[PDB]
C-alpha cells in the first residue's frame, strides 16, 4: 500500500483546485494523536500551546513558497481546548510572489473559530545572526534559576507543564538592569525519536518561551498568568535537533505585557532559530 | 510519520465547511504509475475510463462509511497523461448514504471535469449468484484470441500494451446469444502493486475490452469503442483473484454498446458487478 510522509501536526496536505494558489492541511492536535500535548495545561485542562502555531507556520513556508523563508506577525486568537481528537485546518493563500496569508481554524459542532493568523515570507534574504560563546554567556549570567522552581511558580497562576514541557533545566540571569537570560533547554528524551519532520518541536519552543519569565524584570512586575500571544518574526536557519540553549532579550516588560527576542542555540552557540518580538500577556 | 493513501486518489482532506465535503489531490501521471503508459489512444497515454471507476469505488468507504456502490458514473473528456498529471477528486454528502462525486484536472489556467457519479452507502444489494465456469464455457464454444482482439483495436487507434493485455481469450456462441465469457487476469508483474485498489484499473479495462469480442458488437459497432460511463458499479469483496468476466450485451448499434458485466473468481463467484457499461467513440480527436 503506498504512503505519503506528512508533517506530525499539519497532517494531510492539498492544493485547492483554483486560482490564486491556496494550500489546505487537515491535522489532528488531539491528545490521542499527540499524548505529549496533555502536558501543557491552563487551569488543569489541555490547551494547545502558542508554540504549536509557531511550528505550523514555520512548517508551511517551504511547501507554499519553495523555501524555509520566515513567518511574520503570527497572532494567537481564542485559546484552543484539546480533546482526544481535535481537528485543525491550516490554510495558506499566495497573495503575491514570495508572500502568503496563513491561518489555523477549528470547529465546535457548528461554528468556525480562527485560532492563529500570520504572513509567510519566502523572499526575505535574511543573514543568520552571529554565533555566541556559551561559556561567555554563562560567565555573564551568574545567578541560576532552577527549572523546577520556575515551573512551580507557573503552577501558582494555573499553568501546568508536565514532563513533555519540562525541557527548561535552568535559566541564568544577572540583575534586572541586564536585559538578557541564558537558559539551558532541551527537548525531553522521549520526544527526541519523533523530532524529524518538525522545524522546531513545540515542546522545546515552549520551554524556550518559559525561560523569558525567569528574567528579574519580568519577576518584578508580578503580572500573573503570562501566556504567548504572538510572535513578530520567526525564522529557522537549520535543524533544531541540537538546540541546548536559549538566549532571550527583554524588549519591554510592564502592566500591558512582556515582549522578548529569542535565539535557540546549539552547544557551540550557533543560532538555529530566531523568535523576535515574542509577546506575552494575560 | 506517514499515512496510507489510495494510489490514484492521493492525499485526502475534509473541507472546513458544512454540508460535509471531501477533497483529494492525486497524481495519475506515468512517472508515478508507469503501467498507465500502456493505455494509449492515437499513440499517446490517456487515462482509461476504468481508472475513474476505481476512484469512485475507493471513495465510497471514506465518504459514507461502507463500500456501498457507485451510480451513474460518466467520463466524457479523455485525459492525456504526462509524467505528472494532477487530479482533484471531490465528494459532497447530499443526504445520509448519498454523495455527489467528481473528478477534475488543470491545463494552463482552465478547469476540466473528467468524471461525475453518485456514491451510495444505503443500497442493501445482494451478491448475484455464482456460476459454473465449465457450464459457461460449454455454452460459448467459439474462441476469440486476446492478441487478435487487441490488434483489431489497434486498427482504430487504441493501443493496449502489456499492463492492459490481461484478456487472454473470450468465448462466444453466435450474435443471437447475448453473452460473452472471457478469461481475464491482472498481468503477473502488476500483482505486487495491487494493494489499496478495490479493482485494479488494468484488470477492469481488460474486462471492458472483452465486451467487444461479442459477435453482435463486431457485426454492427465498427468504430472506436471506448468506455463512456457505467450505470451501476459494486464490489462484493476483494478482486485480487478475478479470473473470468461474464458479460451481456444489452444494446448494440452503429454508434456504441451497452453491456452488463460480472467479474468472477476461478470458482465462478461474482466479485464485482458493472451494469450499464456504455461504449462509444466519445471524443477521440
Ligand atoms: Cl509582512
Ligand atoms: Cl487516499
Ligand atoms: Mg513517465
From Swiss-Prot, chain B:
List of catalytic residues: 39 (proton acceptor), 205 (proton donor)
Transmembrane segments: none
Localization (cell): Cell membrane
Region (N-terminal hotdog fold): 6-130
Deletion phenotype: Disruption of this gene abolishes the production of both 2,4-dimethyl-2-eicosenoic acid, a polymethyl-branched fatty acid (PMB-FA), and lipooligosaccharides (LOS). Complementation of the mutant with the wild-type gene fully restores the phenotype.
Coiled coil: none
PKS/mFAS DH domain residues: 6-285
Superkingdom as given in the UniProt entry: Bacteria
Region (Dehydratase (DH)): 1-281
Region called C-terminal hotdog fold, residue ranges: 141-285
Domains (record comment): Is organized in a condensing KS-AT and a modifying DH-PsiKR-ER-KR region, followed by a flexibly tethered ACP domain.
Role played: Polyketide synthase involved in the biosynthesis of 2,4-dimethyl-2-eicosenoic acid, a lipid component of the lipooligosaccharides (LOS) which are not located at the bacterial surface but rather in deeper compartments of the cell envelope of M.smegmatis.
Oligomeric form and interacting partners: Homodimer.
Protein name (Swiss-Prot/TrEMBL): Mycocerosic acid synthase-like polyketide synthase
Organism (species): Mycolicibacterium smegmatis (strain ATCC 700084 / mc(2)155) (Mycobacterium smegmatis)
Taxonomic lineage from the root: Bacteria, Bacillati, Actinomycetota, Actinomycetes, Mycobacteriales
Gene: pks5
Parent sequence residues shown: 896 to 1180 of 2111
